[PDB]
Amino acid sequence: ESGKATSYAELCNEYRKLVRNGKLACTRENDPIQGPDGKVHGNTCSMCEVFFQAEEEEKKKKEGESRN
């Protein structure tokens, strides 16, 4: 337990520039870590991809009907 609690939305933030329409992806960093799901991932982005994915559902709602 070192540093501040920090927050994914703020930590993975640096990966928001990679996430296009809810899909995050970056180089192949060589540093496996863990995520909030107590699960390990390939790189730091992979850990941010799962969090970014969950945010894709909130966008499920459309501002209007595609038929307009």
Q: What name is given to the CATH topology?
A: Wheat Germ Agglutinin (Isolectin 2), domain 1
CATH class: Alpha Beta
| Percent in strands | under 5%
The topology string of helices and strands comes to HH
Tally of separate helices: 2
Biggest beta sheet summary = none
Helix fraction bin: 25-40%
Name the structural class: mainly alpha
Number of domains: 1
Radius of gyration: 14 Å
CATH architecture type? 2-Layer Sandwich
Extended strand count: 0
**Basic shape:** elongated
Distance between the termini: 52 Å
Task: Explain what this protein looks like in three dimensions.
- Disulfide bonds join 12-48, 26-45.
- Residues 6-68 form the Kazal-like domain.
- This is Hemofiltrate peptide HF7665.
- It comes from Homo sapiens (Human).
- This protein is an all-alpha fold.
- The chain has a single domain, classed as 2-Layer Sandwich (Wheat Germ Agglutinin (Isolectin 2), domain 1), CATH 3.30.60.30.
- 28% of the residues lie in helices and 0% in strands.
- It is elongated, with a radius of gyration of 14 Å.
Structure described in brief:
The chain is an all-alpha fold and 68 residues long.
What key attributes describe this structure?
68 residues; mainly alpha; Wheat Germ Agglutinin (Isolectin 2), domain 1; 2 helices; 28% helix; Hemofiltrate peptide HF7665
